[PDB]
């Protein structure tokens, strides 16, 4: 239906891991959604998170921002500290996978508090880059040290609330917080306005960061912004997309991949139906071709909405924002519940 599998999900390593989690293996099945503002608002991914965690187990909050990010949102944690975030939306830098870092400063402090939470000791990992090799920081009072310099992942253990102190400056990327009993996590790596090809803004070794997320299913949710580029080169874009899928597979050989086809957007909300941006249809079609050629799964958000000429109706009923591009909280929740529906069906039939 909405979900088309161009691979062989039932025969896959990731499905086998999901099923055993489903039967109480204690493993953690890690779903990672990387995308644009639809993802960055966390309304879509948090609905997916809550639904699939009830179905298959609360594996914890997963990979979250190291600090508040202007215009973006984490539903599962709250931040209180003096770290300063920076994203690839408007800036350049040495970004780890996801395009977000935070400068801690000296005398730096950040406390993460779970919006719900089970305050037992979680597994904690952090993307981190020290100013100096061998530099330390503390996580709930425990000393954690870098090995050499450059971006790396620090592994430790602590409970929530989680307090991280930096005597000297570091850059920090996403921070993974997992419950030791296992289950599902859903991590949201969104950037307002982003396009898939703009992973090129991130550091050259970004695929090694991806390898270290532990993601068992990678969801790519882009298309809306590509669609608003009147001068986009579909043939070039398609090759870059295929390259990116190839690279994801090389970096995470056991992971599933799901491409979320762009929802309907409107260049202008006038008159019952139109008007679609001129390149939207070509972008959505490219996405499906990439899915098939890359043997990934494909979920048509436009079809989930009711197909072509559905956005104005969604807008009229408050499921989509007035701009005819972004959705309202309940609109995102609705779309994600349909995706969750689609995935549970797939597993059930396996």
GROMACS .gro file of C-alpha atoms in nm:
model
  350
    1UNK     CA    1   0.000   0.000   0.000
    2UNK     CA    2   0.167   0.317   0.126
    3UNK     CA    3   0.480   0.114   0.193
    4UNK     CA    4   0.654  -0.047  -0.106
    5UNK     CA    5   0.942  -0.285  -0.043
    6UNK     CA    6   1.191  -0.293  -0.333
    7UNK     CA    7   1.417  -0.522  -0.134
    8UNK     CA    8   1.347  -0.836   0.067
    9UNK     CA    9   1.261  -0.719   0.416
   10UNK     CA   10   1.145  -1.057   0.546
   11UNK     CA   11   1.482  -1.213   0.454
   12UNK     CA   12   1.687  -0.924   0.597
   13UNK     CA   13   1.923  -0.903   0.897
   14UNK     CA   14   1.732  -0.603   1.038
   15UNK     CA   15   1.393  -0.777   1.033
   16UNK     CA   16   1.545  -1.078   1.210
   17UNK     CA   17   1.673  -0.842   1.480
   18UNK     CA   18   1.334  -0.664   1.510
   19UNK     CA   19   1.146  -0.993   1.549
   20UNK     CA   20   1.377  -1.115   1.827
   21UNK     CA   21   1.341  -0.780   2.005
   22UNK     CA   22   0.966  -0.828   1.958
   23UNK     CA   23   1.000  -1.160   2.142
   24UNK     CA   24   1.202  -1.006   2.427
   25UNK     CA   25   1.566  -1.056   2.325
   26UNK     CA   26   1.681  -0.749   2.520
   27UNK     CA   27   1.863  -0.609   2.218
   28UNK     CA   28   1.815  -0.247   2.109
   29UNK     CA   29   1.663  -0.188   1.767
   30UNK     CA   30   1.774   0.157   1.654
   31UNK     CA   31   1.566   0.359   1.407
   32UNK     CA   32   1.737   0.675   1.279
   33UNK     CA   33   1.545   0.941   1.085
   34UNK     CA   34   1.754   1.196   0.899
   35UNK     CA   35   1.570   1.474   0.719
   36UNK     CA   36   1.441   1.831   0.698
   37UNK     CA   37   1.208   2.048   0.907
   38UNK     CA   38   0.938   1.780   0.912
   39UNK     CA   39   1.191   1.570   1.104
   40UNK     CA   40   1.349   1.859   1.295
   41UNK     CA   41   1.021   1.951   1.469
   42UNK     CA   42   1.008   1.602   1.623
   43UNK     CA   43   0.626   1.590   1.589
   44UNK     CA   44   0.648   1.315   1.325
   45UNK     CA   45   0.935   1.119   1.477
   46UNK     CA   46   0.798   1.140   1.833
   47UNK     CA   47   0.466   0.994   1.723
   48UNK     CA   48   0.654   0.712   1.552
   49UNK     CA   49   0.863   0.679   1.869
   50UNK     CA   50   0.567   0.650   2.106
   51UNK     CA   51   0.376   0.408   1.887
   52UNK     CA   52   0.658   0.165   1.809
   53UNK     CA   53   0.790   0.177   2.169
   54UNK     CA   54   0.451   0.058   2.297
   55UNK     CA   55   0.448  -0.217   2.036
   56UNK     CA   56   0.806  -0.340   2.072
   57UNK     CA   57   0.949  -0.189   2.391
   58UNK     CA   58   1.082   0.144   2.519
   59UNK     CA   59   1.452   0.122   2.435
   60UNK     CA   60   1.507   0.479   2.554
   61UNK     CA   61   1.528   0.827   2.406
   62UNK     CA   62   1.814   0.753   2.166
   63UNK     CA   63   2.036   1.009   1.993
   64UNK     CA   64   1.937   1.365   2.091
   65UNK     CA   65   2.067   1.724   2.054
   66UNK     CA   66   2.352   1.826   2.283
   67UNK     CA   67   2.172   2.160   2.343
   68UNK     CA   68   1.867   2.365   2.243
   69UNK     CA   69   1.870   2.427   1.869
   70UNK     CA   70   1.688   2.739   1.750
   71UNK     CA   71   1.378   2.659   1.546
   72UNK     CA   72   1.404   2.287   1.612
   73UNK     CA   73   1.277   2.054   1.882
   74UNK     CA   74   1.345   1.741   2.086
   75UNK     CA   75   1.024   1.600   2.235
   76UNK     CA   76   1.192   1.339   2.456
   77UNK     CA   77   1.436   1.560   2.652
   78UNK     CA   78   1.473   1.909   2.793
   79UNK     CA   79   1.800   2.104   2.798
   80UNK     CA   80   1.936   2.335   3.067
   81UNK     CA   81   2.292   2.459   3.025
   82UNK     CA   82   2.528   2.713   2.874
   83UNK     CA   83   2.643   2.523   2.564
   84UNK     CA   84   2.591   2.702   2.230
   85UNK     CA   85   2.455   2.508   1.931
   86UNK     CA   86   2.552   2.558   1.566
   87UNK     CA   87   2.392   2.386   1.265
   88UNK     CA   88   2.467   2.337   0.894
   89UNK     CA   89   2.146   2.512   0.793
   90UNK     CA   90   2.325   2.847   0.744
   91UNK     CA   91   2.677   2.766   0.860
   92UNK     CA   92   2.997   2.587   0.769
   93UNK     CA   93   3.204   2.389   1.012
   94UNK     CA   94   3.345   2.051   1.099
   95UNK     CA   95   3.004   1.889   1.157
   96UNK     CA   96   2.959   1.525   1.259
   97UNK     CA   97   2.670   1.328   1.105
   98UNK     CA   98   2.343   1.521   1.150
   99UNK     CA   99   2.484   1.869   1.097
  100UNK     CA  100   2.459   1.983   1.460
  101UNK     CA  101   2.728   2.059   1.714
  102UNK     CA  102   2.744   2.259   2.037
  103UNK     CA  103   3.039   2.464   2.167
  104UNK     CA  104   3.064   2.389   2.541
  105UNK     CA  105   3.315   2.659   2.634
  106UNK     CA  106   3.534   2.635   2.943
  107UNK     CA  107   3.340   2.598   3.266
  108UNK     CA  108   3.070   2.446   3.045
  109UNK     CA  109   2.758   2.276   3.177
  110UNK     CA  110   2.458   2.089   3.031
  111UNK     CA  111   2.182   1.895   3.202
  112UNK     CA  112   1.947   1.672   3.004
  113UNK     CA  113   1.617   1.583   3.168
  114UNK     CA  114   1.384   1.323   3.019
  115UNK     CA  115   1.034   1.451   2.948
  116UNK     CA  116   0.906   1.111   3.068
  117UNK     CA  117   1.194   0.892   3.187
  118UNK     CA  118   1.290   0.581   3.385
  119UNK     CA  119   1.588   0.724   3.588
  120UNK     CA  120   1.780   0.396   3.595
  121UNK     CA  121   2.139   0.401   3.468
  122UNK     CA  122   2.134   0.441   3.089
  123UNK     CA  123   2.400   0.359   2.834
  124UNK     CA  124   2.539   0.692   2.719
  125UNK     CA  125   2.745   0.768   2.412
  126UNK     CA  126   2.842   1.114   2.283
  127UNK     CA  127   2.987   1.243   1.961
  128UNK     CA  128   3.263   1.472   2.088
  129UNK     CA  129   3.570   1.662   1.973
  130UNK     CA  130   3.815   1.792   2.235
  131UNK     CA  131   4.025   2.104   2.186
  132UNK     CA  132   4.324   1.899   2.306
  133UNK     CA  133   4.411   1.530   2.282
  134UNK     CA  134   4.340   1.333   2.605
  135UNK     CA  135   4.111   1.610   2.737
  136UNK     CA  136   3.841   1.504   2.985
  137UNK     CA  137   3.484   1.592   3.075
  138UNK     CA  138   3.252   1.453   3.339
  139UNK     CA  139   2.919   1.277   3.301
  140UNK     CA  140   2.724   1.273   3.630
  141UNK     CA  141   3.055   1.327   3.809
  142UNK     CA  142   3.240   1.044   3.632
  143UNK     CA  143   3.555   1.131   3.438
  144UNK     CA  144   3.540   1.055   3.067
  145UNK     CA  145   3.846   1.105   2.846
  146UNK     CA  146   3.905   1.145   2.473
  147UNK     CA  147   4.157   0.925   2.293
  148UNK     CA  148   4.367   1.157   2.086
  149UNK     CA  149   4.196   1.442   1.906
  150UNK     CA  150   3.930   1.482   1.641
  151UNK     CA  151   3.567   1.371   1.647
  152UNK     CA  152   3.509   1.039   1.819
  153UNK     CA  153   3.239   0.867   2.022
  154UNK     CA  154   3.273   0.857   2.398
  155UNK     CA  155   3.109   0.561   2.573
  156UNK     CA  156   3.003   0.572   2.938
  157UNK     CA  157   2.711   0.503   3.169
  158UNK     CA  158   2.485   0.727   3.375
  159UNK     CA  159   2.124   0.790   3.471
  160UNK     CA  160   1.883   1.071   3.386
  161UNK     CA  161   1.892   1.361   3.467
  162UNK     CA  162   2.228   1.366   3.294
  163UNK     CA  163   2.476   1.643   3.376
  164UNK     CA  164   2.785   1.698   3.165
  165UNK     CA  165   3.062   1.934   3.277
  166UNK     CA  166   3.349   2.059   3.061
  167UNK     CA  167   3.644   2.224   3.230
  168UNK     CA  168   3.799   2.308   2.892
  169UNK     CA  169   3.618   2.356   2.557
  170UNK     CA  170   3.476   2.072   2.348
  171UNK     CA  171   3.244   2.042   2.052
  172UNK     CA  172   2.963   1.793   2.117
  173UNK     CA  173   2.736   1.626   1.859
  174UNK     CA  174   2.436   1.406   1.924
  175UNK     CA  175   2.425   1.219   2.253
  176UNK     CA  176   2.285   0.866   2.267
  177UNK     CA  177   2.089   0.764   2.573
  178UNK     CA  178   1.971   0.400   2.577
  179UNK     CA  179   1.792   0.181   2.831
  180UNK     CA  180   1.997  -0.136   2.911
  181UNK     CA  181   1.682  -0.356   2.900
  182UNK     CA  182   1.663  -0.297   2.523
  183UNK     CA  183   1.371  -0.214   2.292
  184UNK     CA  184   1.317   0.042   2.015
  185UNK     CA  185   1.473   0.387   1.990
  186UNK     CA  186   1.376   0.652   1.738
  187UNK     CA  187   1.636   0.924   1.681
  188UNK     CA  188   1.559   1.242   1.485
  189UNK     CA  189   1.837   1.410   1.287
  190UNK     CA  190   1.657   1.696   1.116
  191UNK     CA  191   1.777   2.029   0.981
  192UNK     CA  192   1.525   2.300   0.886
  193UNK     CA  193   1.537   2.356   0.509
  194UNK     CA  194   1.785   2.074   0.438
  195UNK     CA  195   1.822   1.859   0.126
  196UNK     CA  196   1.985   1.513   0.113
  197UNK     CA  197   2.277   1.629  -0.102
  198UNK     CA  198   2.361   1.881   0.169
  199UNK     CA  199   2.522   1.603   0.372
  200UNK     CA  200   2.822   1.743   0.176
  201UNK     CA  201   2.823   2.029   0.432
  202UNK     CA  202   2.924   1.774   0.698
  203UNK     CA  203   3.275   1.636   0.763
  204UNK     CA  204   3.439   1.402   0.511
  205UNK     CA  205   3.431   1.111   0.760
  206UNK     CA  206   3.055   1.146   0.823
  207UNK     CA  207   2.990   0.784   0.712
  208UNK     CA  208   3.216   0.664   0.994
  209UNK     CA  209   2.990   0.863   1.228
  210UNK     CA  210   2.691   0.684   1.068
  211UNK     CA  211   2.861   0.346   1.120
  212UNK     CA  212   2.882   0.430   1.490
  213UNK     CA  213   2.515   0.524   1.543
  214UNK     CA  214   2.426   0.157   1.555
  215UNK     CA  215   2.119   0.231   1.339
  216UNK     CA  216   1.928  -0.080   1.234
  217UNK     CA  217   1.686   0.115   1.015
  218UNK     CA  218   1.777   0.444   0.846
  219UNK     CA  219   1.488   0.666   0.741
  220UNK     CA  220   1.566   0.937   0.488
  221UNK     CA  221   1.298   1.205   0.482
  222UNK     CA  222   1.376   1.482   0.233
  223UNK     CA  223   1.221   1.610  -0.088
  224UNK     CA  224   1.020   1.914   0.015
  225UNK     CA  225   1.310   2.158  -0.018
  226UNK     CA  226   1.457   1.994  -0.329
  227UNK     CA  227   1.109   2.046  -0.477
  228UNK     CA  228   1.127   2.423  -0.429
  229UNK     CA  229   1.447   2.452  -0.631
  230UNK     CA  230   1.307   2.546  -0.973
  231UNK     CA  231   1.648   2.476  -1.129
  232UNK     CA  232   1.724   2.138  -0.971
  233UNK     CA  233   1.900   1.885  -1.196
  234UNK     CA  234   1.704   1.563  -1.143
  235UNK     CA  235   1.957   1.344  -1.324
  236UNK     CA  236   2.245   1.477  -1.115
  237UNK     CA  237   2.040   1.470  -0.794
  238UNK     CA  238   1.933   1.111  -0.863
  239UNK     CA  239   2.295   0.999  -0.898
  240UNK     CA  240   2.386   1.169  -0.569
  241UNK     CA  241   2.092   1.003  -0.397
  242UNK     CA  242   2.194   0.660  -0.528
  243UNK     CA  243   2.552   0.729  -0.415
  244UNK     CA  244   2.426   0.821  -0.068
  245UNK     CA  245   2.221   0.500  -0.037
  246UNK     CA  246   2.523   0.297  -0.152
  247UNK     CA  247   2.735   0.468   0.111
  248UNK     CA  248   2.479   0.403   0.384
  249UNK     CA  249   2.480   0.033   0.291
  250UNK     CA  250   2.861   0.018   0.295
  251UNK     CA  251   2.868   0.193   0.633
  252UNK     CA  252   2.587  -0.010   0.792
  253UNK     CA  253   2.563  -0.347   0.609
  254UNK     CA  254   2.297  -0.486   0.844
  255UNK     CA  255   2.065  -0.182   0.836
  256UNK     CA  256   1.735  -0.140   0.656
  257UNK     CA  257   1.675   0.178   0.457
  258UNK     CA  258   1.341   0.358   0.414
  259UNK     CA  259   1.292   0.652   0.178
  260UNK     CA  260   1.002   0.881   0.267
  261UNK     CA  261   0.867   1.031  -0.054
  262UNK     CA  262   0.793   1.402  -0.020
  263UNK     CA  263   0.441   1.502   0.093
  264UNK     CA  264   0.235   1.725  -0.133
  265UNK     CA  265   0.339   2.087  -0.089
  266UNK     CA  266   0.180   2.395  -0.243
  267UNK     CA  267   0.362   2.689  -0.399
  268UNK     CA  268   0.039   2.875  -0.336
  269UNK     CA  269  -0.276   2.768  -0.153
  270UNK     CA  270  -0.533   2.927  -0.384
  271UNK     CA  271  -0.821   2.747  -0.548
  272UNK     CA  272  -0.933   2.401  -0.434
  273UNK     CA  273  -0.619   2.219  -0.551
  274UNK     CA  274  -0.307   2.397  -0.669
  275UNK     CA  275  -0.057   2.514  -0.697
  276UNK     CA  276   0.217   2.251  -0.670
  277UNK     CA  277   0.576   2.367  -0.708
  278UNK     CA  278   0.693   2.301  -1.064
  279UNK     CA  279   0.958   2.044  -0.966
  280UNK     CA  280   0.768   1.856  -0.694
  281UNK     CA  281   0.639   1.572  -0.911
  282UNK     CA  282   0.980   1.508  -1.065
  283UNK     CA  283   1.143   1.502  -0.721
  284UNK     CA  284   0.887   1.256  -0.577
  285UNK     CA  285   0.937   1.029  -0.880
  286UNK     CA  286   1.313   1.044  -0.850
  287UNK     CA  287   1.280   0.936  -0.487
  288UNK     CA  288   1.086   0.625  -0.580
  289UNK     CA  289   1.333   0.531  -0.857
  290UNK     CA  290   1.618   0.565  -0.605
  291UNK     CA  291   1.431   0.337  -0.362
  292UNK     CA  292   1.386   0.067  -0.627
  293UNK     CA  293   1.735   0.085  -0.770
  294UNK     CA  294   1.884   0.093  -0.419
  295UNK     CA  295   1.650  -0.189  -0.312
  296UNK     CA  296   1.518   0.012  -0.019
  297UNK     CA  297   1.168   0.056   0.120
  298UNK     CA  298   0.959   0.353   0.003
  299UNK     CA  299   0.671   0.519   0.188
  300UNK     CA  300   0.459   0.765  -0.008
  301UNK     CA  301   0.368   1.050   0.224
  302UNK     CA  302   0.173   1.204  -0.063
  303UNK     CA  303  -0.037   0.887  -0.095
  304UNK     CA  304  -0.073   0.868   0.282
  305UNK     CA  305  -0.229   1.216   0.257
  306UNK     CA  306  -0.484   1.108  -0.005
  307UNK     CA  307  -0.269   1.151  -0.314
  308UNK     CA  308  -0.247   1.455  -0.542
  309UNK     CA  309  -0.464   1.755  -0.451
  310UNK     CA  310  -0.475   1.664  -0.081
  311UNK     CA  311  -0.270   1.938   0.086
  312UNK     CA  312  -0.534   2.210   0.054
  313UNK     CA  313  -0.787   1.981   0.220
  314UNK     CA  314  -0.538   1.905   0.500
  315UNK     CA  315  -0.481   2.278   0.540
  316UNK     CA  316  -0.853   2.355   0.552
  317UNK     CA  317  -0.899   2.102   0.831
  318UNK     CA  318  -0.607   2.213   1.048
  319UNK     CA  319  -0.388   1.909   0.979
  320UNK     CA  320  -0.148   2.130   0.785
  321UNK     CA  321  -0.013   2.481   0.839
  322UNK     CA  322  -0.137   2.786   0.647
  323UNK     CA  323   0.170   2.790   0.424
  324UNK     CA  324   0.065   2.463   0.257
  325UNK     CA  325   0.413   2.319   0.313
  326UNK     CA  326   0.451   2.244   0.684
  327UNK     CA  327   0.210   2.048   0.900
  328UNK     CA  328   0.051   2.111   1.236
  329UNK     CA  329   0.132   1.895   1.537
  330UNK     CA  330  -0.166   1.667   1.479
  331UNK     CA  331  -0.093   1.648   1.107
  332UNK     CA  332   0.255   1.515   1.175
  333UNK     CA  333   0.121   1.277   1.440
  334UNK     CA  334  -0.138   1.145   1.193
  335UNK     CA  335   0.112   1.090   0.913
  336UNK     CA  336   0.350   0.906   1.148
  337UNK     CA  337   0.079   0.678   1.287
  338UNK     CA  338   0.014   0.570   0.928
  339UNK     CA  339   0.385   0.497   0.880
  340UNK     CA  340   0.391   0.304   1.207
  341UNK     CA  341   0.086   0.113   1.080
  342UNK     CA  342   0.269   0.032   0.756
  343UNK     CA  343   0.581  -0.095   0.938
  344UNK     CA  344   0.395  -0.312   1.189
  345UNK     CA  345   0.205  -0.473   0.900
  346UNK     CA  346   0.532  -0.547   0.726
  347UNK     CA  347   0.673  -0.714   1.034
  348UNK     CA  348   0.351  -0.906   1.096
  349UNK     CA  349   0.364  -1.048   0.743
  350UNK     CA  350   0.728  -1.152   0.780
   0.00000   0.00000   0.00000
